[PDB]
Amino acid sequence: NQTTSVAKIAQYKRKLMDLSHRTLQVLIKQEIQRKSGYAIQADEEQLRVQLDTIQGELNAPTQFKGRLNELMSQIRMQNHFGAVRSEERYYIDADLLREIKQHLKQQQEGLSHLISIIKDDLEDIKLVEH
Amino acid sequence: IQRNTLNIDKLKIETAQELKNAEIALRTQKTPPGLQHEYAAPADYFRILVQQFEVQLQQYRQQIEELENHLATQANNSHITPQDLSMAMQKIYQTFVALAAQLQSIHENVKVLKEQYL
Amino acid sequence: DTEGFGELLQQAEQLAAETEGISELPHVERNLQEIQQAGERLRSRTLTRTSQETADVKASVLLGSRGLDISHISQRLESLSAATTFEPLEPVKDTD
Amino acid sequence: ENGEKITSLHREVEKVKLDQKRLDQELDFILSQQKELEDLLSPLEELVKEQSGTIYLQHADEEREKTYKLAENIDAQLKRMAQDLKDIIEHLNTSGAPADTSDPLQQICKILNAHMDSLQWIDQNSALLQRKVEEV
Amino acid sequence: QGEYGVTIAFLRLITTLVKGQLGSTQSQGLVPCVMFVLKEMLPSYHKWRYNSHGVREQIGCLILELIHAILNLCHETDLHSSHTPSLQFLCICSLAYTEAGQTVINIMGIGVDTIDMVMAAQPRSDGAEGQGQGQLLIKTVKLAFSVTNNVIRLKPPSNVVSPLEQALSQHGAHGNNLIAVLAKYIYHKHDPALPRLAIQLLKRLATVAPMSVYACLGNDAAAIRDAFLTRLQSKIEDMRIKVMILEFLTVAVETQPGLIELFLNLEVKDGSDGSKEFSLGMWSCLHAVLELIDSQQQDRYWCPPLLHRAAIAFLHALWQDRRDSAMLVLRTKPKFWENLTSPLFGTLSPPSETSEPSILETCALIMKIICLEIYYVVKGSLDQSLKDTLKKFSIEKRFAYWSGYVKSLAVHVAETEGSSCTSLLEYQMLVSAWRMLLIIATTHADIMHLTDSVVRRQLFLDVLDGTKALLLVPASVNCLRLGSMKCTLLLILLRQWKRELGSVDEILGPLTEILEGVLQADQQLMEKTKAKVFSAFITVLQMKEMKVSDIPQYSQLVLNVCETLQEEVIALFDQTRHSLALGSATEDKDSMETDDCSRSRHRDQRDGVCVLGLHLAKELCEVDEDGDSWLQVTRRLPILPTLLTTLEVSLRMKQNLHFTEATLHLLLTLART
Amino acid sequence: AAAAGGPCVRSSRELWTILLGRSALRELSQIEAELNKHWRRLLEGLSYYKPPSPSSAEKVKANKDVASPLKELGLRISKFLGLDEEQSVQLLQCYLQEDYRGTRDSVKTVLQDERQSQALILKIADYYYEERTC
């Protein structure tokens, strides 16, 4: 049922994406229709200057779209050669592993207390704010 | 199941703000044209949408720069040693002790505010 | 015994996933030298708010209120940085 | 001992068998909200198609359609670049893992990542709580 | 005025005076004229007034003809005279380190669409020598690429990127990406010299730029690929464009990963068994490489050998640099190994005729691909068309043909040192490839079908004579280097075939002649050869019981070995005495880096000339039944006192263990008589 | 198009590049063959390129081997250049083999963005003028 909820969520996020794009395609046309026959306004040239700037960074060959294709190149090469590097299996003693498990446990139980205190304090302070 | 909770109430907030976006389209169409110039809300929506694009582009720049940190060091990584592991445990523990010491120095101020106000 | 780290990892993924202010995008499984750097890139911000002259003291007050000594865990983390575990010199490998 | 352990474990189970039943009710509530959003949009989508027969008459109409269509293009590039980044991160994490997850070293290194995440949340939320202690 | 009649005359004058100083010391006399052109004229002439169109373009053309003349001066290398910088070096440094370089960049940055537009504007149909403004602009831009391609070739090796090399990789935030403009010259059809000089610069940015050439093409990258592929396929294209495209793709295997994926264009499929099938997709470069090597089209279109060479060099890099997703998709092609190996079934002219060196490289590179495939594809999964191709190579006796050729080619090199023998690098490549093929043909003899002991005995004797000819030229660093490489092969063949070399008499003579030439040559180069020759003699003496009657010139062989041992044991003695004067070295136990020089040679190694000389002296003492032949050599040399004095220090220090034991072994053999 | 083995009808600029000796072609017989093949274009001159016709328009519509957006742009090129509908679809295919500085699939979006479709018609006019010149 947990796995079925993950599948419901992954359907409903994709359905919100459809509906939000449809709201945007309605509002865009209603605004073009609302301002039709009027000159460009200061709000509207500001909106355009921000959109032209954003479209600049999205097209720039050393911003996002260049880097994302180079990351995908690097990962493919590293995986193609990494599967031919030669495992040096450091066997670690069962009792050094027993101590490392206890260290990580006490540190994780400690982290859990800090993550309590920050949530506890962040609802107490909301009760002074009201 | 708790990982479904946080994904559901996020999607509920997302869906409730998109219902509120589409109410601006329903109100704009219902407003007579002789008053449609008094209804700022479509321009407030487009300004907020651009501010959301500007924040998303900072987040998507950071994750590319964190991925380029990760691959630039993973390209040199040739084994894990026991020394890399001990020095990772030691550094995370020293960061844990330092952050517990900071949190004490905030949690005591939270108590002093609490005993001043309730 | 045989009850390994995967039980503790299952609780580690919980402590992260109950602190996730869920993003639009996933997180990266950092390699061990990014983990060493992420620790020190964070401690170098904590130690511009708290002086190390009081750090382990205030941490021991806060976590001692929950039953943790920091001194025994530090002296263990010193033995876990002196413990020269052994060298498995036998595996035949390679293609060159 | 086994009697009280089993009697605890069945209470532990029936709690989670209520929490899942909260999530199915909230999911099918979100489905109702997304259905209302669609029956609100669908009449607007058609009335705006009829009004799309209006003839543009100034260069200010042309440049205005281009401005608002640039936002529709940026939306359809950002919501793509999110999936393009997501496939990069999901392919990185699923190839940085050697083929035996029963290994203690992989299990320790993944514990140390989630500890580093826990600490990066503790840094950020201590740096939020202290600001509220500076705002009262 | 805006008019340049004296400037046009001056640039022609200085260009003629520089072109007239090929062969005199007066080159310093033009430095102020050349520096004035590089500093005052070159960075400024685009900022000047002009009254007439194309004059700016002719001034730039004449400045770049002067610079291209200076950058193609030869040096006759008198390595021993003056502290004065050459006119070429001053030009290189001025272009690498100043605005003079950025001007040559701005001229390459004009772009092909601007040339195409100027040629479309011209009121003419220019005859082939007519200096119309677009053909003049093509001359200026070709000269700019040619200047940059000479500056980057003639810069001394240094760990520093010059501002010229940096400004060839930098992204000007409000400018065209220069690498994308350099690559867009692939669209230029009106002169096939322009795209070649652009691709020749891209082949060097691929080996020196700190950023991916693929990212620097961005949204153009796939269209630029589709254009490069269309010219590589085109049956009317300049062959030298196809060679420069293939060699740019060779370097893209070596250094440009995302660019070689883009050009490989592998279309993946889901296998029924969870395996990823790969296939040659509609824009794979390998479709054109597979047409160029097809014998069943070479009977119809003569593929000229420098182009077959370039197609095979690209295939060699894909095997060197383990591009297995491409190699799998080539291993699955019908006739791949039949067509690929077809030049190894040819017949070459002798080395004393003008053979085309591209064919010698082609055969050397095919041999390297066969070596890499048989090394990686561990005794099983190798292709069946390759398995019967290696069998065909054995049945046609091609082992004995290529044996006789790599023998005569090594004699011809020893017969032509002292002339300026131009093809020596390709000769070294073929000798290197034949060495690699034969060491794999002993260890994988079952797969190579190399199981005839008569053919193995010929391969050994042709490697022996073919080593002797290169080690009897003690003045030639080239012959010594090739001879020490073949002596490494000879020693492997000797030990792996020490049951089929059924006579010893034929081996001892040429090994003494090899030793005596290896004693006439440099001690520091030939240490790593003296050891191989002593190791060969030990292995040969170990094959058969022999007497002093049976070893050619035994009393000189024992002398040559004893005199070499007295070099080695004195050098070991003082090495062990300087470690007794330099107190406290540290245990510097981390340094995981690879093969460079000058860290000191420990002479106490099992492979050391000293230690192999002691064991050779032992095997030679076990042949002199009364000891009277050896005692006539040690009645000359003080070698016993020398060995004992070094043994005495080695024992006191607990140093030199292999020498200490080998000395006691020689003494224990001597104590028998 | 480049997967159907039809006899591609060379540009006059490909022929020009060959007769200039700037190609790799060195066989007398290959220049003889391409001259005996094309001398009628050299004798038809500019009149090798012809005005629009309802018969050419009907063939272009009825042809199955040309994808619709290349017919629909070819008929726009025909009106814009005063050119025969079959020759306009040929000229478009020559430009999309010789000088289109994009991928075979950016051709899809350049046939869907009307501002890019108009910019492509103008580059094909300059290509028509180099063809007539050649």
PDB file of all heavy atoms in Angstrom, chain A residues 84 86 88 91 96-97 101 103 106 108 113 117 119, chain C residues 3-5 7-8 11-12 18 66 80 86 93-95:
ATOM      1  N   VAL A  84      36.660  -1.742 -14.772  1.00  0.00           N
ATOM      2  CA  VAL A  84      37.928  -2.401 -15.135  1.00  0.00           C
ATOM      3  C   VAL A  84      39.061  -2.042 -14.149  1.00  0.00           C
ATOM      4  O   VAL A  84      40.180  -2.539 -14.291  1.00  0.00           O
ATOM      5  CB  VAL A  84      38.298  -2.108 -16.613  1.00  0.00           C
ATOM      6  CG1 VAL A  84      39.393  -3.043 -17.158  1.00  0.00           C
ATOM      7  CG2 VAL A  84      37.097  -2.284 -17.559  1.00  0.00           C
ATOM      8  N   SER A  86      40.622  -2.570 -10.295  1.00  0.00           N
ATOM      9  CA  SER A  86      40.855  -3.873  -9.673  1.00  0.00           C
ATOM     10  C   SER A  86      40.683  -3.832  -8.155  1.00  0.00           C
ATOM     11  O   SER A  86      41.550  -3.341  -7.441  1.00  0.00           O
ATOM     12  CB  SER A  86      42.237  -4.384 -10.099  1.00  0.00           C
ATOM     13  OG  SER A  86      43.153  -3.361 -10.444  1.00  0.00           O
ATOM     14  N   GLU A  88      40.724  -3.976  -4.414  1.00  0.00           N
ATOM     15  CA  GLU A  88      41.596  -4.312  -3.285  1.00  0.00           C
ATOM     16  C   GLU A  88      40.742  -4.390  -2.022  1.00  0.00           C
ATOM     17  O   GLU A  88      40.488  -3.409  -1.330  1.00  0.00           O
ATOM     18  CB  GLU A  88      42.825  -3.385  -3.231  1.00  0.00           C
ATOM     19  CG  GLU A  88      43.701  -3.804  -4.421  1.00  0.00           C
ATOM     20  CD  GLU A  88      45.061  -3.123  -4.552  1.00  0.00           C
ATOM     21  OE1 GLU A  88      45.133  -2.040  -5.168  1.00  0.00           O
ATOM     22  OE2 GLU A  88      46.042  -3.884  -4.394  1.00  0.00           O
ATOM     23  N   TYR A  91      39.816  -6.483   4.009  1.00  0.00           N
ATOM     24  CA  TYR A  91      39.097  -7.166   5.074  1.00  0.00           C
ATOM     25  C   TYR A  91      39.399  -6.429   6.386  1.00  0.00           C
ATOM     26  O   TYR A  91      40.558  -6.176   6.704  1.00  0.00           O
ATOM     27  CB  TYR A  91      39.485  -8.657   5.081  1.00  0.00           C
ATOM     28  CG  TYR A  91      38.969  -9.493   6.244  1.00  0.00           C
ATOM     29  CD1 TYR A  91      37.691  -9.269   6.797  1.00  0.00           C
ATOM     30  CD2 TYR A  91      39.791 -10.501   6.791  1.00  0.00           C
ATOM     31  CE1 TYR A  91      37.269  -9.990   7.931  1.00  0.00           C
ATOM     32  CE2 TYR A  91      39.363 -11.242   7.909  1.00  0.00           C
ATOM     33  CZ  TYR A  91      38.110 -10.973   8.494  1.00  0.00           C
ATOM     34  OH  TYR A  91      37.718 -11.660   9.599  1.00  0.00           O
ATOM     35  N   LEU A  96      36.871  -4.375  15.124  1.00  0.00           N
ATOM     36  CA  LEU A  96      36.956  -2.997  14.624  1.00  0.00           C
ATOM     37  C   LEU A  96      35.627  -2.570  13.969  1.00  0.00           C
ATOM     38  O   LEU A  96      35.157  -1.451  14.168  1.00  0.00           O
ATOM     39  CB  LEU A  96      38.174  -2.876  13.686  1.00  0.00           C
ATOM     40  CG  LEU A  96      38.406  -1.466  13.110  1.00  0.00           C
ATOM     41  CD1 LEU A  96      38.548  -0.399  14.189  1.00  0.00           C
ATOM     42  CD2 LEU A  96      39.695  -1.437  12.291  1.00  0.00           C
ATOM     43  N   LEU A  97      34.951  -3.484  13.263  1.00  0.00           N
ATOM     44  CA  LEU A  97      33.586  -3.262  12.768  1.00  0.00           C
ATOM     45  C   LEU A  97      32.552  -3.161  13.913  1.00  0.00           C
ATOM     46  O   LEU A  97      31.611  -2.372  13.804  1.00  0.00           O
ATOM     47  CB  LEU A  97      33.217  -4.374  11.768  1.00  0.00           C
ATOM     48  CG  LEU A  97      34.011  -4.355  10.446  1.00  0.00           C
ATOM     49  CD1 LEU A  97      33.638  -5.581   9.611  1.00  0.00           C
ATOM     50  CD2 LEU A  97      33.733  -3.108   9.599  1.00  0.00           C
ATOM     51  N   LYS A 101      30.474   0.301  14.461  1.00  0.00           N
ATOM     52  CA  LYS A 101      29.005   0.276  14.576  1.00  0.00           C
ATOM     53  C   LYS A 101      28.520   0.996  15.838  1.00  0.00           C
ATOM     54  O   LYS A 101      27.556   1.753  15.751  1.00  0.00           O
ATOM     55  CB  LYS A 101      28.452  -1.161  14.487  1.00  0.00           C
ATOM     56  CG  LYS A 101      26.924  -1.108  14.294  1.00  0.00           C
ATOM     57  CD  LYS A 101      26.234  -2.475  14.263  1.00  0.00           C
ATOM     58  CE  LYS A 101      24.721  -2.220  14.187  1.00  0.00           C
ATOM     59  NZ  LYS A 101      23.926  -3.461  14.285  1.00  0.00           N
ATOM     60  N   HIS A 103      30.178   3.417  17.643  1.00  0.00           N
ATOM     61  CA  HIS A 103      30.458   4.844  17.415  1.00  0.00           C
ATOM     62  C   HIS A 103      29.356   5.502  16.573  1.00  0.00           C
ATOM     63  O   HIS A 103      28.731   6.475  16.994  1.00  0.00           O
ATOM     64  CB  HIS A 103      31.831   5.015  16.741  1.00  0.00           C
ATOM     65  CG  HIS A 103      32.098   6.459  16.396  1.00  0.00           C
ATOM     66  ND1 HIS A 103      32.503   7.424  17.311  1.00  0.00           N
ATOM     67  CD2 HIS A 103      31.712   7.082  15.243  1.00  0.00           C
ATOM     68  CE1 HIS A 103      32.340   8.607  16.704  1.00  0.00           C
ATOM     69  NE2 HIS A 103      31.860   8.433  15.462  1.00  0.00           N
ATOM     70  N   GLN A 106      25.949   5.671  18.638  1.00  0.00           N
ATOM     71  CA  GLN A 106      25.919   6.724  19.659  1.00  0.00           C
ATOM     72  C   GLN A 106      25.879   8.122  19.019  1.00  0.00           C
ATOM     73  O   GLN A 106      25.119   8.985  19.459  1.00  0.00           O
ATOM     74  CB  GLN A 106      27.128   6.564  20.600  1.00  0.00           C
ATOM     75  CG  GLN A 106      27.019   5.288  21.451  1.00  0.00           C
ATOM     76  CD  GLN A 106      28.231   5.078  22.355  1.00  0.00           C
ATOM     77  OE1 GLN A 106      29.289   4.641  21.938  1.00  0.00           O
ATOM     78  NE2 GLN A 106      28.126   5.329  23.641  1.00  0.00           N
ATOM     79  N   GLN A 108      24.489   8.714  15.985  1.00  0.00           N
ATOM     80  CA  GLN A 108      23.156   8.797  15.371  1.00  0.00           C
ATOM     81  C   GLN A 108      22.034   9.022  16.391  1.00  0.00           C
ATOM     82  O   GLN A 108      21.113   9.800  16.140  1.00  0.00           O
ATOM     83  CB  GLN A 108      22.910   7.519  14.563  1.00  0.00           C
ATOM     84  CG  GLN A 108      21.698   7.622  13.634  1.00  0.00           C
ATOM     85  CD  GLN A 108      21.766   6.519  12.590  1.00  0.00           C
ATOM     86  OE1 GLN A 108      22.575   6.570  11.680  1.00  0.00           O
ATOM     87  NE2 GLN A 108      20.985   5.471  12.700  1.00  0.00           N
ATOM     88  N   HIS A 113      18.612  13.316  19.096  1.00  0.00           N
ATOM     89  CA  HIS A 113      18.321  14.279  20.168  1.00  0.00           C
ATOM     90  C   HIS A 113      18.441  15.737  19.707  1.00  0.00           C
ATOM     91  O   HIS A 113      17.563  16.530  20.037  1.00  0.00           O
ATOM     92  CB  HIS A 113      19.208  14.022  21.391  1.00  0.00           C
ATOM     93  CG  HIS A 113      18.875  12.745  22.118  1.00  0.00           C
ATOM     94  ND1 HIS A 113      17.684  12.485  22.808  1.00  0.00           N
ATOM     95  CD2 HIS A 113      19.700  11.666  22.241  1.00  0.00           C
ATOM     96  CE1 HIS A 113      17.814  11.237  23.294  1.00  0.00           C
ATOM     97  NE2 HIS A 113      19.016  10.726  22.974  1.00  0.00           N
ATOM     98  N   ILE A 117      15.382  18.498  19.637  1.00  0.00           N
ATOM     99  CA  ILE A 117      15.511  19.821  20.275  1.00  0.00           C
ATOM    100  C   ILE A 117      15.216  20.961  19.291  1.00  0.00           C
ATOM    101  O   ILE A 117      14.429  21.843  19.604  1.00  0.00           O
ATOM    102  CB  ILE A 117      16.908  19.946  20.930  1.00  0.00           C
ATOM    103  CG1 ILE A 117      17.020  18.983  22.137  1.00  0.00           C
ATOM    104  CG2 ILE A 117      17.187  21.384  21.399  1.00  0.00           C
ATOM    105  CD1 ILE A 117      18.467  18.683  22.551  1.00  0.00           C
ATOM    106  N   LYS A 119      13.255  20.829  16.612  1.00  0.00           N
ATOM    107  CA  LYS A 119      11.809  20.776  16.316  1.00  0.00           C
ATOM    108  C   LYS A 119      10.964  21.216  17.510  1.00  0.00           C
ATOM    109  O   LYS A 119       9.979  21.918  17.303  1.00  0.00           O
ATOM    110  CB  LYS A 119      11.403  19.361  15.873  1.00  0.00           C
ATOM    111  CG  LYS A 119      11.966  19.023  14.488  1.00  0.00           C
ATOM    112  CD  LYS A 119      11.720  17.554  14.128  1.00  0.00           C
ATOM    113  CE  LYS A 119      12.355  17.265  12.764  1.00  0.00           C
ATOM    114  NZ  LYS A 119      12.253  15.832  12.402  1.00  0.00           N
TER     115      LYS A 119
ATOM    116  N   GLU C   3      24.430  -9.209  13.189  1.00  0.00           N
ATOM    117  CA  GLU C   3      23.429  -8.155  12.975  1.00  0.00           C
ATOM    118  C   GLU C   3      24.143  -6.840  12.604  1.00  0.00           C
ATOM    119  O   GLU C   3      24.496  -6.028  13.458  1.00  0.00           O
ATOM    120  CB  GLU C   3      22.484  -8.092  14.191  1.00  0.00           C
ATOM    121  CG  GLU C   3      21.604  -9.363  14.218  1.00  0.00           C
ATOM    122  CD  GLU C   3      20.706  -9.498  15.453  1.00  0.00           C
ATOM    123  OE1 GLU C   3      20.202  -8.487  15.994  1.00  0.00           O
ATOM    124  OE2 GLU C   3      20.460 -10.643  15.899  1.00  0.00           O
ATOM    125  N   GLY C   4      24.451  -6.701  11.307  1.00  0.00           N
ATOM    126  CA  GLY C   4      25.377  -5.704  10.747  1.00  0.00           C
ATOM    127  C   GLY C   4      24.870  -4.256  10.661  1.00  0.00           C
ATOM    128  O   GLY C   4      23.948  -3.848  11.365  1.00  0.00           O
ATOM    129  N   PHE C   5      25.498  -3.460   9.788  1.00  0.00           N
ATOM    130  CA  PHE C   5      25.267  -2.012   9.674  1.00  0.00           C
ATOM    131  C   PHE C   5      23.948  -1.639   8.980  1.00  0.00           C
ATOM    132  O   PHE C   5      23.420  -0.568   9.252  1.00  0.00           O
ATOM    133  CB  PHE C   5      26.447  -1.359   8.943  1.00  0.00           C
ATOM    134  CG  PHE C   5      27.755  -1.381   9.698  1.00  0.00           C
ATOM    135  CD1 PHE C   5      28.614  -2.491   9.587  1.00  0.00           C
ATOM    136  CD2 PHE C   5      28.128  -0.277  10.486  1.00  0.00           C
ATOM    137  CE1 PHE C   5      29.839  -2.501  10.274  1.00  0.00           C
ATOM    138  CE2 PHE C   5      29.363  -0.283  11.151  1.00  0.00           C
ATOM    139  CZ  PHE C   5      30.219  -1.389  11.046  1.00  0.00           C
ATOM    140  N   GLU C   7      20.862  -2.387   9.492  1.00  0.00           N
ATOM    141  CA  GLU C   7      19.864  -2.002  10.505  1.00  0.00           C
ATOM    142  C   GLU C   7      20.046  -0.545  10.970  1.00  0.00           C
ATOM    143  O   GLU C   7      19.074   0.202  11.078  1.00  0.00           O
ATOM    144  CB  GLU C   7      19.955  -3.038  11.645  1.00  0.00           C
ATOM    145  CG  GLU C   7      19.347  -2.644  13.003  1.00  0.00           C
ATOM    146  CD  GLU C   7      20.421  -2.097  13.956  1.00  0.00           C
ATOM    147  OE1 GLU C   7      21.303  -2.894  14.351  1.00  0.00           O
ATOM    148  OE2 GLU C   7      20.409  -0.885  14.250  1.00  0.00           O
ATOM    149  N   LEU C   8      21.294  -0.108  11.149  1.00  0.00           N
ATOM    150  CA  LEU C   8      21.657   1.251  11.557  1.00  0.00           C
ATOM    151  C   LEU C   8      21.490   2.238  10.390  1.00  0.00           C
ATOM    152  O   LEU C   8      20.945   3.325  10.578  1.00  0.00           O
ATOM    153  CB  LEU C   8      23.084   1.179  12.132  1.00  0.00           C
ATOM    154  CG  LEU C   8      23.490   2.345  13.049  1.00  0.00           C
ATOM    155  CD1 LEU C   8      24.675   1.881  13.894  1.00  0.00           C
ATOM    156  CD2 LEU C   8      23.960   3.591  12.301  1.00  0.00           C
ATOM    157  N   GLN C  11      17.923   3.333   9.894  1.00  0.00           N
ATOM    158  CA  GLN C  11      17.610   4.437  10.808  1.00  0.00           C
ATOM    159  C   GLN C  11      18.308   5.745  10.378  1.00  0.00           C
ATOM    160  O   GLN C  11      17.736   6.823  10.528  1.00  0.00           O
ATOM    161  CB  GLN C  11      17.984   4.008  12.237  1.00  0.00           C
ATOM    162  CG  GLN C  11      17.085   2.880  12.777  1.00  0.00           C
ATOM    163  CD  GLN C  11      17.735   2.154  13.949  1.00  0.00           C
ATOM    164  OE1 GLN C  11      17.497   2.454  15.105  1.00  0.00           O
ATOM    165  NE2 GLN C  11      18.575   1.184  13.668  1.00  0.00           N
ATOM    166  N   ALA C  12      19.488   5.667   9.754  1.00  0.00           N
ATOM    167  CA  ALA C  12      20.188   6.815   9.172  1.00  0.00           C
ATOM    168  C   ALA C  12      19.374   7.447   8.028  1.00  0.00           C
ATOM    169  O   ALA C  12      19.131   8.655   8.032  1.00  0.00           O
ATOM    170  CB  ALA C  12      21.579   6.366   8.700  1.00  0.00           C
ATOM    171  N   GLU C  18      13.300  12.423   7.541  1.00  0.00           N
ATOM    172  CA  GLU C  18      12.484  13.219   8.472  1.00  0.00           C
ATOM    173  C   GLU C  18      13.136  14.570   8.833  1.00  0.00           C
ATOM    174  O   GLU C  18      12.660  15.277   9.728  1.00  0.00           O
ATOM    175  CB  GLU C  18      12.076  12.396   9.710  1.00  0.00           C
ATOM    176  CG  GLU C  18      11.172  11.209   9.341  1.00  0.00           C
ATOM    177  CD  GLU C  18      10.352  10.714  10.542  1.00  0.00           C
ATOM    178  OE1 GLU C  18       9.354  11.398  10.879  1.00  0.00           O
ATOM    179  OE2 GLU C  18      10.652   9.615  11.063  1.00  0.00           O
ATOM    180  N   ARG C  66      21.000  13.657  27.832  1.00  0.00           N
ATOM    181  CA  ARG C  66      20.411  12.526  27.101  1.00  0.00           C
ATOM    182  C   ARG C  66      21.218  11.225  27.250  1.00  0.00           C
ATOM    183  O   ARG C  66      20.884  10.241  26.592  1.00  0.00           O
ATOM    184  CB  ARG C  66      20.222  12.922  25.626  1.00  0.00           C
ATOM    185  CG  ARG C  66      19.459  14.237  25.378  1.00  0.00           C
ATOM    186  CD  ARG C  66      18.015  14.206  25.896  1.00  0.00           C
ATOM    187  NE  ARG C  66      17.311  15.477  25.624  1.00  0.00           N
ATOM    188  CZ  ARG C  66      16.448  15.738  24.652  1.00  0.00           C
ATOM    189  NH1 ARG C  66      16.185  14.899  23.689  1.00  0.00           N
ATOM    190  NH2 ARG C  66      15.811  16.874  24.627  1.00  0.00           N
ATOM    191  N   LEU C  80      40.272   4.465  17.056  1.00  0.00           N
ATOM    192  CA  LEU C  80      39.819   4.274  15.669  1.00  0.00           C
ATOM    193  C   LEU C  80      40.603   5.108  14.628  1.00  0.00           C
ATOM    194  O   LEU C  80      40.364   4.959  13.426  1.00  0.00           O
ATOM    195  CB  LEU C  80      38.309   4.577  15.580  1.00  0.00           C
ATOM    196  CG  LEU C  80      37.374   3.647  16.383  1.00  0.00           C
ATOM    197  CD1 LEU C  80      35.940   4.179  16.324  1.00  0.00           C
ATOM    198  CD2 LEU C  80      37.379   2.231  15.823  1.00  0.00           C
ATOM    199  N   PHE C  86      44.748  -4.828   9.166  1.00  0.00           N
ATOM    200  CA  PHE C  86      45.740  -5.590   8.393  1.00  0.00           C
ATOM    201  C   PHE C  86      45.594  -5.514   6.856  1.00  0.00           C
ATOM    202  O   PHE C  86      44.561  -5.126   6.316  1.00  0.00           O
ATOM    203  CB  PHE C  86      45.732  -7.035   8.923  1.00  0.00           C
ATOM    204  CG  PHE C  86      44.343  -7.641   9.041  1.00  0.00           C
ATOM    205  CD1 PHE C  86      43.618  -7.965   7.879  1.00  0.00           C
ATOM    206  CD2 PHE C  86      43.737  -7.793  10.305  1.00  0.00           C
ATOM    207  CE1 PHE C  86      42.293  -8.413   7.982  1.00  0.00           C
ATOM    208  CE2 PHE C  86      42.413  -8.256  10.405  1.00  0.00           C
ATOM    209  CZ  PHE C  86      41.684  -8.554   9.241  1.00  0.00           C
ATOM    210  N   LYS C  93      44.620  -9.966  -9.964  1.00  0.00           N
ATOM    211  CA  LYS C  93      43.684  -8.986 -10.541  1.00  0.00           C
ATOM    212  C   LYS C  93      44.143  -8.564 -11.958  1.00  0.00           C
ATOM    213  O   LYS C  93      44.923  -9.268 -12.595  1.00  0.00           O
ATOM    214  CB  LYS C  93      43.630  -7.765  -9.584  1.00  0.00           C
ATOM    215  CG  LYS C  93      43.375  -8.003  -8.078  1.00  0.00           C
ATOM    216  CD  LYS C  93      43.723  -6.785  -7.197  1.00  0.00           C
ATOM    217  CE  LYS C  93      45.221  -6.421  -7.285  1.00  0.00           C
ATOM    218  NZ  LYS C  93      45.521  -5.085  -6.722  1.00  0.00           N
ATOM    219  N   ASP C  94      43.696  -7.380 -12.381  1.00  0.00           N
ATOM    220  CA  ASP C  94      44.291  -6.519 -13.415  1.00  0.00           C
ATOM    221  C   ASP C  94      44.169  -6.947 -14.890  1.00  0.00           C
ATOM    222  O   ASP C  94      44.051  -8.114 -15.256  1.00  0.00           O
ATOM    223  CB  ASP C  94      45.734  -6.118 -13.044  1.00  0.00           C
ATOM    224  CG  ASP C  94      45.881  -5.757 -11.562  1.00  0.00           C
ATOM    225  OD1 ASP C  94      45.100  -4.889 -11.113  1.00  0.00           O
ATOM    226  OD2 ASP C  94      46.698  -6.394 -10.864  1.00  0.00           O
ATOM    227  N   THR C  95      44.209  -5.944 -15.774  1.00  0.00           N
ATOM    228  CA  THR C  95      44.332  -6.112 -17.230  1.00  0.00           C
ATOM    229  C   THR C  95      45.221  -5.003 -17.798  1.00  0.00           C
ATOM    230  O   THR C  95      44.745  -3.909 -18.091  1.00  0.00           O
ATOM    231  CB  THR C  95      42.960  -6.114 -17.946  1.00  0.00           C
ATOM    232  OG1 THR C  95      42.170  -4.994 -17.611  1.00  0.00           O
ATOM    233  CG2 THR C  95      42.103  -7.343 -17.657  1.00  0.00           C
TER     234      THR C  95
END
